[PDB]
């Protein structure tokens, strides 16, 4: 099971970031399975952005709501993330991660991507 | 001619029976669909709602004389059939058991199904109809009789004698 | 499906092996009514219906024949003359979300009880004695359906359970769904008791040389003596001869 | 209240047992499951323990987790040299309704 | 105002019977989850009984088999028959309408004291 | 059957200040709850149900909090008439079910 993000790594301020998590090994139509996003600034602690279950439960980070839109294209086995109004504080690494079922509790964040260092500057 | 319809009534008031052949397959269904005043002339379907209980599909039945015997007595509806090269011919040939279905619907009336290319379709039309090729179909009714059958060395029926036709036969 | 929106299905016209189930899961709840679970695979039925849904933890006791409750009396009820059984396995690995899985509900309010295998979907606003709060809130204007809201912090009594209910029929049955088979490996050339697909007899079986027509299964000599049979497994024709006997 | 706190340093020595703390509040650590990840410099983290006591397939045995009231602990046995990396907490916050993490510990053996 | 007022409270000799009555207004009982609660003098409360909107009722274990809730739907009222009142049953009984997860019990009854001879 | 225990039993705080009552469960109670104010002399009155939802009419001076096994009622500014008994009633099993507490006595000066 693998996930991988892709998109533009460099963008001017007041522009939008787009990211595409292409995966292999699971489908976002079964029960349990869900896909989320986790960012980490350069030299900071982890931070949760959003999550999207298999039944289309578009969870968002509240403090980060009104800016994010995450959507799935399960037929193409891909997830799309979009974030408007980028800023120099959003320079970070963005991973797309997987949440499935376990043996006595749903699993969350069992598998992570490999990141895409994104710099917002000129 | 592409199919048949059996049952105690054409309305949805009883779980009538439908058998439709096609270039691809046979489709058998039992769903009490209320039909129009006349079987629709294909424009692929004309019937009311259904409460289907059984459906089945299999390979298709396809100057060629197709012969069929339809019987439904013991809770099963049975079909026999035969396809022969070439009015009714005098040649002898036995029908072979094609299918024995377990459906127990009480069938009392029956009709045939027709179709046609680029033909209009309405629930009801007068005796004007729609154009079609020259064709014909014969119908006969069975009776309880005593038959003397002759089996050959290979297990195929080659001749038969009606025990009650004439004195010599008897 | 939800408790009040069970997914009815029929499973007939098949050689049903009721022991393929047992290799699936721990089968938390497995008890059969009207038919023994042990003697399921063999017995035959008219039509086997399957209803699948998810409930809470402490409400699994309410799914039983003739049992009253709030999921049994309000949105899913099975008869007293029920034939079949219910199978429930806790599933909160795919059903409990962090925050509350507001996808499974249960009729909490209604007017009266429902008849067995009575499924209702209506999502109107329940009355308030007088003319209700159509499309609004207030003193006691309470919707009849209520979500379970599973989360991975609920106790085991509040966890989701997946459940399948099989409804059989035994009255007037056209045997269509059951599992017999079991073909005792074949023996030849010894006077042996045989049961070929129902034809029972005794004798020595020998390789045949006669061409049965493809729709034929039996052979008879004069006076109906069953002379041959085709294997229901390899469709090979075999000759039957009564084992040797005589006077001394 | 809405952010988990970990000590930045562990500083063990080979073959010893150490613990790493994580303090929360009634709303995140006291009413949800607590996860524990592992993140190496310049690479995505990798799950170590979910649901406070369960291990994803592929994590060694020496890591154990514990939750107690409004506190969390990670216990590392058999300290070795291939483990100096970041260690993270994780929890769902009902009051904030979001995932929160801790700072991280180096754990460089001497 | 919408209310449930109760009667039947009093004193009865041990082994005797009793009947509590509950009248309502501006709200129906036939289709309403009914719940009888009681309170011993100076102590807390305890759920005594419930009747559903379809009729399937339930009672607590401490009073199971002895008390019976019923409701005169025709005239929008509730009743609870009690029997075999022993030394414990000295308490004030309240009639209530419980909604549950979407808003807990709100409208209550004035209550009725039920003590025994001794 | 989750047993709820309120605390403290008694509380004497200067008028005009806050008041804090904790009630602790032993199993899970997530948001199936309520808080009743039984002014001495008649039936209790529901103030705040679920987690923190204020029952209709109930003065805003109240605030509920907690989830799981622990809940709390908080009063903003006690007036002279706030003196009454309080009970946190759970219904985590609603049809048919409730489990009461031992009660809390609140007074003024
Ligand atoms: C025993 C039975 O089913 N009899 C029916 C009869 O009632 C019906 O009138 C007829 C055709 O309508 O078919 C046959
Ligand atoms: C007496 C009777 O059979 N009435 C039928 C009903 O069963 C069926 O559901 C409906 C639609 O097919 O047509 C009519
Ligand atoms: C009447 C009849 O069937 N006679 C059979 C013939 O069919 C078969 O082809 C042949 C074997 O070659 O043996 C003879």
């Amino acid at each position: 099971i693998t996930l991988k993000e892709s998109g533009l790594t460099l963008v001017r301020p007041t522009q939008t970031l787009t990211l595409t998590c292409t995966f292999s090994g699971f489908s976002l139509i079964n029960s349990g399975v869900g896909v989320g996003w986790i960012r980490q600034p350069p030299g900071k602690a982890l931070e949760w952005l959003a999550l999207i279950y298999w039944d289309d439960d578009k969870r968002y980070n509240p403090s980060l709501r009104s800016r994010l839109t995450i959507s799935k294209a399960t037929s193409k086995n891909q997830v799309v993330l979009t974030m408007t109004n980028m800023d120099p504080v959003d320079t970070a690494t963005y991973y797309c991660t997987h949440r499935g079922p376990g043996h006595n509790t749903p699993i969350y964040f069992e598998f992570w991507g490999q990141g895409a260092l994104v710099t917002v500057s000129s | 001619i592409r199919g048949w319809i059996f049952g105690t009534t054409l309305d949805s008031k009883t779980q009538s029976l439908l058998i439709v052949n096609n270039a691809t397959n046979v489709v058998i269904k039992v769903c009490e669909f209320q039909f129009c005043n006349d079987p629709f002339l294909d424009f692929r379907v004309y019937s009311s709602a259904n409460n289907c209980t059984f459906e089945y599909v299999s390979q298709p039945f396809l100057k060629n004389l197709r012969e069929f015997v339809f019987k439904n007595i013991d809770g099963y509806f049975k079909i026999y059939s035969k396809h022969t090269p070439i009015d009714l011919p005098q040649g002898f040939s036995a029908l072979e058991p094609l299918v024995d279905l377990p459906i127990g619907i009480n069938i009392t009336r029956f009709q045939t199904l027709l179709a046609l290319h680029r033909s209009y379709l309405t629930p009801g039309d007068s005796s004007s109809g729609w154009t079609a090729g020259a064709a014909a179909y014969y119908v006969g009714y069975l009776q309880p009789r005593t038959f003397l059958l002759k089996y050959n060395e290979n297990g195929t029926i080659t001749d038969a004698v009606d025990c009650a036709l004439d004195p010599l036969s008897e | 499906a939800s408790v009040y929106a069970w997914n009815r299905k029929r499973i007939s016209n098949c050689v049903a092996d009721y022991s393929v189930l047992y290799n699936f899961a721990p089968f938390f709840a497995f008890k059969c009514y009207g038919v023994s679970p042990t003697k399921l695979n063999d017995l035959c039925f008219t039509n086997v219906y399957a209803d699948s849904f998810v409930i809470r933890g402490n409400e699994v006791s309410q799914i039983a024949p003739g049992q009253t409750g709030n999921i049994a009396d309000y949105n899913y009820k099975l008869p007293d003359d029920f034939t079949g059984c219910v199978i429930a396995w806790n599933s909160n690995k795919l059903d409990s979300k962090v925050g509350g899985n507001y996808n499974y509900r249960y009729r909490l309010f209604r007017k009266s009880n429902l008849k067995p295998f009575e499924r209702d979907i209506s999502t109107e606003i329940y009355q308030a004695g007088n003319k209700p709060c159509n499309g609004v809130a207030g003193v006691n204007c309470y919707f009849p359906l209520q979500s379970y809201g599973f989360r991975p912090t609920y106790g085991v009594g509040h966890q989701p359970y997946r459940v399948v209910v099989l409804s059989f029929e035994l009255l007037h049955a056209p045997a269509t769904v059951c599992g017999p088979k079991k073909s005792t490996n074949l023996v030849k050339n010894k006077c042996v008791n045989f049961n070929f697909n129902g034809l029972t007899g005794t004798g020595v079986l020998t390789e045949s040389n006669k061409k049965f027509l493809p729709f034929q299964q039996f052979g008879r000599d004069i006076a109906d003596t069953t002379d041959a049979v085709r294997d229901p497994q390899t469709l090979e024709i075999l000759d039957i001869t009564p084992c040797s006997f005589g006077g001394v | 209240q809405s952010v988990l706190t970990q000590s930045p340093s562990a500083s063990g020595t080979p073959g010893q047992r150490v613990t790493i703390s994580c303090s929360g509040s009634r709303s995140n650590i006291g009413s949800n499951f607590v996860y524990w990840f592992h993140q190496l410099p310049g690479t995505a983290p990798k799950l170590l323990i979910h649901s406070n006591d369960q291990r994803p397939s592929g994590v060694p045995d020496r890591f154990s987790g514990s939750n107690s009231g409004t506190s969390a602990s990670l216990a590392i046995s058999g300290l070795r040299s291939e483990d100096e990396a970041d260690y993270y907490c994780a929890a769902w916050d009902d009051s904030l309704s979001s995932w929160v993490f801790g700072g991280g510990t180096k754990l460089t053996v001497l | 105002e919408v209310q449930l007022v109760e009667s039947g409270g009093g004193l009865v000799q041990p082994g005797g019977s009793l009947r509590l009555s509950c009248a309502a207004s501006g709200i129906t009982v036939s289709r309403n989850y009914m719940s009888w609660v009681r309170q011993a003098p100076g102590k807390g409360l305890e759920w005594v009984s419930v009747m559903f909107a379809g009729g399937s009722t339930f009672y607590a274990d401490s009073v199971k088999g002895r008390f019976t809730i019923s409701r005169d739907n025709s005239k929008n009222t509730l009743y609870l028959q009690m029997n075999s009142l022993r030394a414990e049953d000295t308490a004030v009984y309240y009639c209530a309408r419980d909604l549950g997860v979407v808003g807990a019990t709100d409208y209550w009854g004035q209550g009725t004291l039920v003590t025994v001879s001794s | 059957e989750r047993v709820m225990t309120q605390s403290p039993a008694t509380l004497s705080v200067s008028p005009g200040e806050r008041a804090t009552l904790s009630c602790r469960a032993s199993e899970s109670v997530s948001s199936d709850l309520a808080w009743y104010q039984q002014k001495p002399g008649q039936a209790p009155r529901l103030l705040i149900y679920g987690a923190s939802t204020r029952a209709t009419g109930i003065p805003a001076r109240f605030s509920g909090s907690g989830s799981g096994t622990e809940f709390t009622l908080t009063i903003s500014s006690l007036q002279s008439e706030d003196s009454a008994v309080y009970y946190c009633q759970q219904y985590n099993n609603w049809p048919p079910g409730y489990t009461f507490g031992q009660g809390t006595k609140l007074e003024i000066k």
Side-chain angles (χ1 to χ4, degrees), chain A, chain B residues 1-8 14 16-20 23-31 35-36 38-42 45 49 51-58 60-62 64-115 117 119 121-125 127-130 132-170, chain C residues 1-67 69-79 82-110 112-114 116-126 128-139 141-168 170-175 177-180 183-206 208 210 212-216 218-220 222-223 226-232 234-248, chain D, chain E residues 1-30 32-70 72 74-75 77-97 99-118, chain F residues 1 3-38 40-109:
Chain A
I1 181 185
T2 79
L3 299 88
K4 168 70 170 323
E5 310 89 35
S6 43
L8 59 87
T9 69
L10 167 141
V11 76
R12 281 80 59 170
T14 84
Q15 274 315 281
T16 49
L17 179 147
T18 317
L19 283 184
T20 305
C21 181
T22 42
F23 48 90
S24 88
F26 62 99
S27 160
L28 284 155
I29 73 162
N30 35 33
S31 193
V33 179
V35 68
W37 287 79
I38 289 294
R39 92 174 171 182
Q40 160 177 31
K44 195 255 150 183
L46 310 180
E47 273 312 328
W48 176 65
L49 186 143
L51 264 162
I52 42 165
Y53 290 101
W54 72 106
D55 64 9
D56 200 48
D57 176 5
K58 294 333 210 194
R59 317 263 198 205
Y60 291 104
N61 197 354
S63 176
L64 295 174
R65 80 180 63 188
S66 73
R67 205 199 47 236
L68 321 153
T69 175
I70 182 71
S71 314
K72 321 187 316 185
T74 317
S75 317
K76 314 280 282 187
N77 272 296
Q78 75 96 40
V79 174
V80 296
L81 174 71
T82 302
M83 200 210 295
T84 316
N85 322 297
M86 212 156 175
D87 324 280
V89 59
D90 290 6
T91 313
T93 65
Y94 294 73
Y95 309 98
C96 68
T97 186
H98 156 70
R99 72 158 294 272
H103 300 307
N104 61 32
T105 298
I107 305 318
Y108 275 72
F109 316 132
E110 36 190 7
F111 199 75
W112 292 66
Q114 307 89 26
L117 184 58
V118 167
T119 308
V120 176
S121 48
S122 315
Chain B
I1 180 160
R2 296 202 172 197
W4 300 262
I5 60 184
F6 314 143
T8 302
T14 58
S16 84
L17 179 150
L18 170 62
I19 290 163
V20 305
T24 82
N25 52 18
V26 187
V27 172
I28 307 181
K29 279 170 70 174
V30 50
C31 351
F35 307 107
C36 305
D38 56 68
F40 54 87
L41 187 132
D42 296 332
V45 285
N51 301 60
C52 220
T53 65
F54 167 87
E55 44 268 3
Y56 168 99
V57 55
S58 300
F61 306 148
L62 309 178
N64 186 357
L65 169 54
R66 313 186 196 278
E67 283 178 290
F68 298 85
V69 156
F70 302 107
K71 192 201 295 184
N72 186 341
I73 64 187
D74 53 307
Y76 292 72
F77 161 81
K78 315 176 189 180
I79 300 175
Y80 309 74
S81 44
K82 188 73 160 69
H83 290 37
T84 298
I86 289 192
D87 314 332
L88 305 178
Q90 309 262 13
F92 189 95
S93 312
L95 310 190
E96 300 161 13
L98 198 63
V99 194
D100 179 351
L101 294 82
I103 291 320
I105 178 61
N106 173 12
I107 294 175
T108 297
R109 314 186 92 183
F110 91 100
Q111 265 283 17
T112 185
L113 302 174
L114 300 310
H117 284 175
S119 315
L121 178 61
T122 79
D125 65 328
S127 307
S128 44
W130 195 264
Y137 75 93
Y138 310 84
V139 161
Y141 280 69
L142 306 176
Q143 305 177 23
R145 306 277 275 205
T146 300
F147 269 49
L148 183 73
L149 311 171
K150 172 171 180 180
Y151 294 82
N152 65 352
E153 294 82 354
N154 269 354
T156 63
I157 302 168
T158 64
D159 307 87
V161 169
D162 194 343
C163 192
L165 173 58
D166 51 44
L168 181 63
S169 59
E170 193 180 58
Chain C
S2 84
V3 188
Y4 62 89
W6 39 282
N7 45 78
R8 189 73 146 202
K9 193 185 175 141
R10 188 191 143 171
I11 290 154
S12 305
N13 53 69
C14 60
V15 57
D17 180 274
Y18 292 95
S19 314
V20 298
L21 292 63
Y22 309 145
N23 60 76
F24 203 108
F27 277 170
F28 152 72
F30 176 79
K31 61 181 68 180
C32 294
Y33 317 90
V35 185
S36 88
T38 85
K39 203 179 63 64
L40 205 41
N41 188 340
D42 45 7
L43 173 82
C44 299
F45 317 87
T46 299
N47 49 329
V48 175
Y49 293 168
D51 317 329
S52 298
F53 52 100
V54 167
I55 52 171
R56 215 211 298 277
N58 46 348
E59 304 176 351
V60 297
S61 43
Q62 293 194 7
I63 177 150
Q67 186 159 357
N70 189 285
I71 68 183
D73 267 358
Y74 278 141
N75 43 333
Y76 180 72
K77 149 80 172 167
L78 59 160
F82 171 74
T83 176
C85 45
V86 50
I87 177 93
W89 72 89
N90 169 291
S91 316
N92 89 328
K93 328 303 176 291
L94 295 73
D95 272 0
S96 283
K97 310 205 180 142
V98 195
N101 204 340
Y102 308 120
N103 288 167
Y104 303 97
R105 305 223 278 291
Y106 81 100
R107 191 171 310 269
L108 168 58
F109 284 147
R110 196 195 181 268
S112 301
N113 300 350
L114 59 164
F117 300 147
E118 167 163 335
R119 167 182 55 188
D120 186 301
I121 182 65
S122 317
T123 56
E124 43 83 1
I125 192 152
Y126 184 78
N130 280 185
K131 190 69 185 83
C133 330
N134 42 79
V136 292
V139 51
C141 229
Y142 297 137
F143 199 60
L145 205 54
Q146 268 85 0
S147 199
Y148 279 153
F150 301 122
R151 47 184 47 84
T153 65
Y154 275 178
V156 311
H158 291 207
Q159 295 183 9
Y161 277 70
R162 300 188 159 186
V163 299
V164 181
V165 178
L166 311 171
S167 89
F168 299 142
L170 276 202
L171 75 163
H172 209 240
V177 50
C178 48
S183 227
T184 60
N185 179 9
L186 181 74
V187 61
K188 298 172 70 181
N189 301 93
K190 289 182 177 69
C191 96
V192 67
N193 289 359
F194 53 77
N195 186 346
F196 275 107
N197 216 344
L199 175 66
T200 169
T202 76
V204 307
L205 305 174
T206 308
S208 306
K210 325 280 95 177
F212 269 1
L213 296 174
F215 63 91
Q216 293 166 329
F218 277 102
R220 281 186 172 184
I222 289 83
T226 57
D227 178 67
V229 303
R230 83 157 69 242
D231 305 332
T234 194
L235 280 64
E236 170 62 291
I237 315 306
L238 288 310
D239 288 335
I240 296 162
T241 306
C243 55
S244 295
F245 77 104
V248 74
Chain D
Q1 207 303 312
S2 203
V3 163
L4 265 181
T5 58
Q6 318 186 26
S7 53
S9 64
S11 300
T13 55
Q16 74 163 39
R17 163 44 74 86
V18 181
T19 82
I20 292 283
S21 159
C22 205
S23 287
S25 175
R26 264 165 165 161
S27 54
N28 48 302
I29 206 165
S31 174
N32 215 63
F33 282 146
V34 179
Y35 287 58
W36 275 95
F37 297 79
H38 161 266
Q39 195 267 332
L40 198 70
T43 182
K46 165 41 179 180
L47 193 51
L48 202 43
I49 276 298
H50 55 90
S51 199
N52 309 66
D53 57 305
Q54 205 168 9
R55 45 186 267 163
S57 77
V59 300
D61 317 280
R62 43 146 176 159
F63 292 95
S64 42
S66 76
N67 180 1
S68 42
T70 301
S71 314
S73 275
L74 172 76
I76 60 167
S77 174
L79 263 172
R80 55 184 157 177
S81 301
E82 51 90 38
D83 64 1
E84 48 185 14
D86 204 309
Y87 291 84
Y88 287 108
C89 295
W92 172 268
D93 199 320
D94 62 352
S95 50
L96 164 57
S97 88
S98 88
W99 286 84
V100 302
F101 294 77
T105 190
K106 211 53 65 161
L107 182 49
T108 293
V109 311
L110 319 184
Chain E
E1 178 260 341
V2 306
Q3 279 291 10
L4 279 58
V5 193
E6 289 66 33
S7 65
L11 260 65
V12 57
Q13 184 181 111
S17 177
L18 183 148
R19 179 186 191 197
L20 304 166
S21 170
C22 176
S25 176
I27 185 66
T28 71
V29 57
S30 65
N32 287 34
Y33 272 99
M34 293 334 282
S35 198
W36 283 71
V37 282
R38 84 192 197 181
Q39 172 172 0
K43 312 92 157 172
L45 314 173
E46 61 269 2
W47 174 95
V48 189
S49 88
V50 61
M51 170 256 298
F52 287 4
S56 46
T57 177
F58 306 88
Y59 308 86
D61 46 49
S62 44
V63 309
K64 254 312 180 183
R66 54 202 294 253
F67 298 169
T68 176
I69 182 159
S70 46
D72 275 33
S74 88
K75 64 180 178 61
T77 65
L78 188 61
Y79 302 101
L80 199 150
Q81 294 59 59
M82 288 142 80
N83 314 354
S84 54
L85 262 61
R86 322 303 319 206
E88 64 270 50
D89 277 27
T90 287
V92 58
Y93 289 62
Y94 288 101
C95 200
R97 195 276 197 274
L99 296 172
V101 179
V102 54
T105 300
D106 38 5
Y107 296 87
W108 284 63
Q110 289 42 68
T112 58
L113 194 60
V114 176
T115 306
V116 184
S117 309
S118 288
Chain F
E1 284 301 81
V3 307
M4 314 281 294
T5 180
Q6 289 195 187
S7 280
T10 299
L11 56 89
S12 162
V13 302
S14 59
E17 199 256 345
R18 292 180 65 253
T20 181
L21 285 76
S22 198
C23 92
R24 182 154 328 176
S26 317
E27 66 98 3
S28 158
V29 180
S30 73
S31 87
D32 289 345
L33 215 64
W35 282 76
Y36 298 106
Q37 173 218 10
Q38 183 202 9
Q42 209 289 339
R45 176 176 70 140
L46 161 71
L47 293 176
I48 289 176
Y49 53 108
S52 313
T53 77
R54 283 199 330 274
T56 182
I58 296 324
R61 292 189 315 169
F62 303 90
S63 157
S65 157
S67 199
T69 76
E70 313 262 9
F71 304 82
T72 182
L73 177 57
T74 51
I75 291 179
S76 313
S77 89
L78 295 170
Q79 310 321 132
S80 316
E81 299 68 16
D82 190 290
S83 57
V85 196
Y86 299 74
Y87 300 72
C88 51
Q89 182 211 70
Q90 65 178 20
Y91 56 102
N92 321 321
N93 44 1
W94 184 217
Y98 293 132
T99 299
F100 294 97
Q102 59 65 58
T104 47
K105 290 338 155 191
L106 285 64
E107 65 99 9
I108 282 300
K109 79 167 64 193

